[PDB]
Design an enzyme around this catalytic site. Structure first.
Site, short mmCIF file in Angstrom:
data_model
loop_
_atom_site.label_atom_id
_atom_site.label_comp_id
_atom_site.label_asym_id
_atom_site.label_seq_id
_atom_site.Cartn_x
_atom_site.Cartn_y
_atom_site.Cartn_z
N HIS A 196 -9.36 5.39 -2.19
CA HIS A 196 -7.87 5.13 -1.77
C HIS A 196 -7.42 3.94 -2.99
O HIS A 196 -7.67 2.88 -2.66
CB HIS A 196 -7.91 4.55 -0.21
CG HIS A 196 -6.67 3.98 0.30
ND1 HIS A 196 -6.51 3.28 1.42
CD2 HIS A 196 -5.56 4.13 -0.53
CE1 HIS A 196 -5.29 3.11 1.47
NE2 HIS A 196 -4.60 3.58 0.48
N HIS A 253 -1.87 10.69 5.30
CA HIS A 253 -2.41 9.54 4.74
C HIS A 253 -4.00 9.93 4.73
O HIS A 253 -4.46 9.41 3.64
CB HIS A 253 -1.95 8.29 5.38
CG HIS A 253 -1.78 6.97 4.57
ND1 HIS A 253 -1.66 7.27 3.34
CD2 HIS A 253 -2.18 5.92 5.09
CE1 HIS A 253 -1.47 5.83 2.62
NE2 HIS A 253 -1.98 5.15 3.98
N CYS A 306 0.76 -1.21 -0.13
CA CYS A 306 -0.07 0.03 -0.10
C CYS A 306 0.90 1.37 -0.07
O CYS A 306 0.22 2.45 0.09
CB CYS A 306 -0.92 0.12 0.98
SG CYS A 306 -2.06 1.31 1.34
#
Lengths: 1105, 67
Positions: free
Chosen positions: A331, A293, A161
């Site tokens: 995301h 983030h 990720c």
């Protein structure tokens, strides 16, 4: 070390076909996450209904990338979109891809999924071999390197990720250490396999609302999204455009964490941020914006934001802006970092901070948000100026943080050169692409950096991009021209015109260019000793200025030399040189046989020598007659002057004989004319006297002769002598012969090969008709100047543009002063302007190509969703409910038919239960259900033993009437009393049925046992078992009876939803009826007919003694 | 600050466990994801450095050694 800069950038993001659309969505507040059914039918398996998805995945220009039609279908969509996006990224910065070919530039692609490989290899009997070349994870970088010929490292990271930012860090290390000169960084993620979203949902990471509510109280999870973004990292020595400079990028892992692997650690993130901003020598105050983030998870956000507060916001005074691009587009796991980088760079370019959606209240676990030390960007904010930071933190534990110094280059101070018109040349895969580039160029006509960058990237071979175009900007008569380019090399030739072209005020429109001015000044220096200046002559105004021979000759030579200098600046070199008699001088300059000073001196000396001697006036006249015929026709004292073409022949001589023959021709009616030379019959015998002094002067003029390159074709002497010594080297004798011998222009033309690109290098394209007729029909004359035209710079630029359309690669940046780099901030993006040929649609895997007979594991432990079955205890031993098999078979039929259970009304028929499955206290028992659709039969087997057999099929036409309550045979009007839950289940206990709370669902029943109310939860097993309980309740037979056969069962979820009526409390209840005369048990949407129960022997365990 | 570079090119076990939407367990992502091949090692051994899972085919291990 060396500076690392972000030269270019491109990508396709959720509901954004290009970066410009991405920005239009970011500022406009649009929510790029949608609720469509592109990848799969929404709500499948309970997945969040919302996911940001790319607009299209079936487009790819395979031909341009050398991928055959079969290989294209077998390729991964990620790789195709990545090739396109990387090509856009290289061109965004103006770096022509062919410049990097063979370079050590290295590709780093961060990817996390290979669903296409899993799909295209599902059937081992027909799978194609080339599926591995195009779908392997390692080919994300390897294919790019193969196409672009990058000899540097080619890796494909996963890093859980944070792949994109880890690849950016590795590329920064490579370019910093000098290992690689440039890098390409990519990030790719596509949603094709619902099983992965199901896994993430089960882990508890996905948000049921389907939104990443960053920094907010309602934070639940994150919304999965697709992304393909590529960036071009180059050292500052190469960058043409700079977005930002990477001050420092780092990486660290959280290591051992007591909470678990998937628990974000704030201490380690703070350590990394502090270490980086200390190693880079950057004060914490200098930061202006940190792109957190912002995944939206409850635990992660407090940790990350508190870490940022400790590392940065501890010792500053003005508040820090915090943002999260994931609240907009969702995301993309592997590509999250590069999406944030794209957002940040776009916002920096446009002078605003793209707001942050889904934020209406801070998270009270973050003291910074409550106080003013951190400021979330809930609306646009102008960019005040400072260093930015981006951090992506994978759930494995890998962190990445990069500091950025934004580019702040102001627009250049205006200069006079900006007023002069420019030229824009474009090359595209389709006419529409070139037209788009030209339109965008015309919109920004005044931005020199934009035009220079566009012209840099337009030099691509005609085979790859078949359509070309050009547009002169800054002039009144400017309109884009576009035409397809025939392939193959086309030779380039130069034709230098003759004595005729000379007019008042010529060249001033070109003096504004630099190279032309320098050439004219050099010529003036060369001729300075003789008292006249070419610049003054050009700047003159008297219409008698060019009546003199010497002025005309010298100015003409100077202008031709200047034009030839201009053509050289753009890299053009001729494969053929052919000149009219004055021109060969200039032609000689073209091949280098003469130096500029020598050529200009020779021209002036020719003029002066012609002036020195006096001859009787004689007019050179042009006659439209056959050359050989002209020979016989010509009277005494005249000789042919110019063999212009097959038809055109200009004869010269004494004025009286020429007048007489002109009168004779006029009698014939044939074409008859005389060019103006001051009444001088050039290239005739009269010139013989002028020769001796001419040779004397030229000998000094030409010190050491040089060879005439094979390219130069001599109109001075016939081909028969083309091996002769005299015609072998540019010498004084050569010029004397040219002044004496007649012109042989037509002969030299026949050697111009088919498909030649000629250029009439002269102050006026006088020979356009002559060349058009003489040359083969395929050729292209492309004239450069014209007579009396208002702006000859526009004509010259259009000539260069036509040259470009014809196949020749001429870069006009050389003509004008170079543009400084890096380019100013705010220059229009080039990525959106690159359009491809997307006529065809390539295979893209569907959701049915992934796994989804049916086997079911009944786990009765506490955590299992089937834990409620432990309440179905009869005789003291737990047994799988009879209706439990029905639910399993129903789910199997729904899965095969591809619908959900709630959407499938079903009919069971002739069911038979052959044995009872005992649910073990510890362990599991696995039931397998097989269907025969054609026979409409089903079987449930347990370890190979038949359990349930019968028929199940979809109910074609549901009808609500079937569930109307049958009129009870007994009126029961009094209804004084009823059995409560406690009493009915007490009776059932006495009979031996020992149902637990979950299967206790008969709120009340009538004394006779025919009517009652059944509680409804989401479980069908319990509801149907309660119906069977009601059926058993009213029987007179003692002992426990279990179902063994049911004739027919109908279920209809729609009518079931309609029937359920909420009670005064929150509970939902269904009214049941049991008609023993008719043998039907009806409740809500269920209808049991022909139930038959058989007594079961008591276990006689007698555990009580 | 020691870091784990791992050369891996096959995640087949990820497919086998994630083939049944009805009964899959979220643990499979932690135990089978390609990136976890190094993150699990870093988590157990308490390594604060890089944790990468390279994927170049037939040269991934030596590429990890070079890195």
């Amino acid at each position: 070390p060396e500076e690392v800069v972000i030269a270019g950038m491109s990508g396709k993001l959720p509901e954004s076909e290009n970066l410009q659309e991405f920005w239009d969505n970011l500022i406009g507040g649009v929510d790029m996450v949608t609720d469509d059914d592109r990848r799969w039918k929404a709500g499948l398996y309970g997945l969040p209904r919302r996911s940001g998805k790319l607009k299209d995945l079936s487009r790819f220009d395979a031909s341009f990338f050398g991928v055959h039609p079969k290989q294209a279908h077998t390729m991964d969509p990620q790789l195709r979109l990545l090739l396109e996006v990387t090509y856009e990224a290289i061109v965004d910065g103006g770096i022509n891809p062919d410049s990097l070919r063979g370079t050590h530039t290295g590709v780093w692609v961060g990817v996390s999924g290979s669903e296409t490989s899993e799909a295209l290899s599902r059937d081992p009997e027909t799978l194609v071999g080339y599926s591995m070349v195009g779908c392997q994870r390692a080919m994300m970088a390897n294919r790019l390197s193969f196409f672009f010929d990058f000899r540097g490292p080619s890796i494909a990271l996963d890093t859980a990720c944070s792949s994109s930012l880890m690849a950016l860090q590795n590329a920064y290390q490579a370019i910093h250490s000098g290992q690689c000169p440039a890098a390409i960084v990519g990030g790719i993620n596509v949603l094709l396999k619902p099983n992965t979203s199901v896994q993430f949902l089960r882990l508890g990471m996905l948000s049921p609302e389907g939104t990443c509510k960053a920094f907010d109280t309602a934070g639940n999870g994150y919304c999965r999204s697709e992304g393909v973004v590529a960036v071009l990292l180059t050292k500052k020595s190469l960058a043409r455009r700079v977005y930002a400079t990477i001050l420092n990028a780092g990486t660290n892992t959280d290591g051992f964490k007591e909470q678990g692997v998937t628990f974000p650690s704030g201490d380690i993130q703070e350590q990394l941020i502090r270490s980086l901003y200390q190693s880079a020598g950057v004060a914490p105050e200098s930061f202006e914006y940190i792109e957190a983030h912002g995944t939206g998870t409850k635990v992660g956000d407090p940790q990350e934001l508190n870490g940022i507060t400790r590392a940065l916001c501890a010792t500053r005074q003005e508040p820090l802006l915090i943002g999260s691009t994931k609240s907009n587009m969702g995301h993309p796991e592997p590509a999250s970092g590069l999406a944030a980088l794209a957002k940040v760079l776009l916002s920096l370019e446009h002078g605003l901070w793209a707001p942050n959606l889904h934020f209406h209240s801070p998270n009270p676990e973050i003291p910074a948000l409550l106080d003013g030390r951190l400021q979330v960007v809930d609306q646009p904010l102008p960019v005040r100026g400072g260093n930015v930071g981006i951090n992506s933190f994978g759930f494995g534990g890998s962190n990445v943080h990069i500091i950025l110094r934004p580019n702040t280059q102001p627009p250049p101070a205006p200069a006079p050169h900006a007023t002069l018109p420019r030229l824009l040349r474009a090359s595209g895969r389709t006419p529409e692409a070139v037209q788009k580039l030209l339109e965008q160029g015309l919109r920004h006509s005044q931005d020199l950096a934009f035009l220079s960058m566009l012209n840099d990237i337009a030099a691509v071979p005609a085979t790859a991009m078949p359509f070309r175009g050009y547009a002169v900007l800054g002039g009144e008569r400017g309109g884009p021209e576009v035409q397809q380019v025939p392939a193959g090399e086309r030779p380039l030739w130069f034709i230098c015109s003759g004595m005729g072209t000379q007019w008042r005020g010529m060249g001033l429109s070109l003096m504004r260019l630099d190279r032309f001015r320098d050439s004219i000044l050099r010529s003036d220096e060369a001729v300075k000793p003789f008292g006249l200046k070419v610049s003054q002559l050009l700047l003159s105004t008297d219409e008698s200025t060019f009546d003199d021979i010497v002025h005309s000759f010298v100015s003409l030579t100077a202008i031709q030399i200047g034009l030839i200098d201009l053509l050289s600046c753009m890299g053009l070199r001729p494969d053929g040189i052919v000149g009219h008699s004055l021109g060969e001088v200039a032609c000689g300059y073209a091949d280098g046989c003469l130096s500029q000073e020598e050529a200009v001196l020779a021209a002036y000396w020719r003029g002066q020598c012609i002036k020195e001697a006096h001859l009787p006036p004689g007019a050179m006249a042009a006659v439209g007659l056959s050359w050989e015929e002209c020979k016989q026709r010509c009277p005494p004292g005249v000789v042919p002057a110019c063999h212009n073409s097959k038809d055109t022949v200009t004869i010269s001589g004494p004025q009286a004989p020429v007048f007489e023959f002109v009168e004779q021709l006029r009698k014939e009616g044939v074409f008859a004319k005389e060019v103006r030379t001051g009444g001088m019959a050039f290239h005739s015998y009269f010139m013989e006297a002028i020769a001796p002094p001419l040779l004397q002067e030229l000998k000094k003029v030409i010190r050491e002769p040089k060879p005439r390159s094979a390219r130069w074709l001599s109109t001075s002497i016939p081909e028969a002598q083309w091996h002769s010594s005299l015609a072998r080297t540019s010498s004084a004798e050569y010029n004397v012969n040219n002044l004496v011998s007649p012109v042989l222009f037509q002969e030299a033309l026949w050697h111009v090969p088919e498909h030649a690109v000629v250029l009439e290098i002269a102050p006026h394209a006088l020979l356009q008709a002559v060349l058009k007729r003489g040359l083969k029909p395929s050729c292209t004359i492309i004239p450069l100047m014209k007579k009396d035209h208002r702006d000859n710079l526009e004509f010259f630029l259009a000539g260069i543009g036509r040259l470009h359309l014809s196949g020749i690669d001429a870069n006009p940046n050389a003509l004008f002063p170079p543009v400084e780099f890096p380019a100013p901030r705010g220059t229009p993006l080039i990525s959106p302007l690159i359009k491809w040929d997307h006529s065809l649609a390539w295979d893209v895997p569907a959701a049915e190509d992934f796994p989804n007979a049916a086997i079911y594991n009944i786990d009765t432990s506490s955590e299992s969703p089937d834990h409620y079955l432990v309440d179905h205890t009869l005789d003291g031993r737990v047994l799988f409910p009879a209706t439990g098999y029905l639910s399993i078979v129903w789910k199997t039929l729904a899965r095969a038919l591809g619908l959900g259970v709630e959407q499938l009304p079903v009919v069971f028929e002739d069911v038979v239960l052959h044995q009872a499955t005992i649910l073990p206290k510890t362990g599991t028992v696995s039931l397998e259900v097989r269907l025969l659709e054609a026979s409409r039969a089903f079987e449930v087997s347990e370890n190979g033993n038949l359990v349930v057999s019968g028929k199940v099929y979809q109910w074609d036409d549901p009808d609500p009437r079937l569930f109307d309550h049958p009129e009870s045979p007994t009126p029961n009007p009094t209804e004084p009393l009823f059995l409560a839950q406690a009493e009915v289940y007490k009776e059932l206990r006495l009979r031996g049925y020992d149902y637990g709370p979950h299967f206790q669902g008969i709120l009340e029943a009538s004394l006779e046992g025919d009517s009652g109310r059944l509680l409804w939860k989401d479980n069908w097993v319990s509801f149907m078992d309660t119906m069977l309980q009601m059926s058993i309740l009213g029987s007179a037979k003692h002992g426990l009876y279990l179902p063994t056969r049911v004739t027919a069962i109908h279920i209809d979820p729609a009518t079931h939803r309609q029937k359920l009526y909420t009670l005064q409390d929150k509970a939902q209840v269904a009214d049941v009826v049991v008609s023993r005369w008719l043998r039907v048990t009806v409740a809500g949407g269920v209808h049991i007919s022909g139930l038959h129960t058989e007594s079961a022997p008591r276990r006689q365990q007698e555990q009580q003694v």
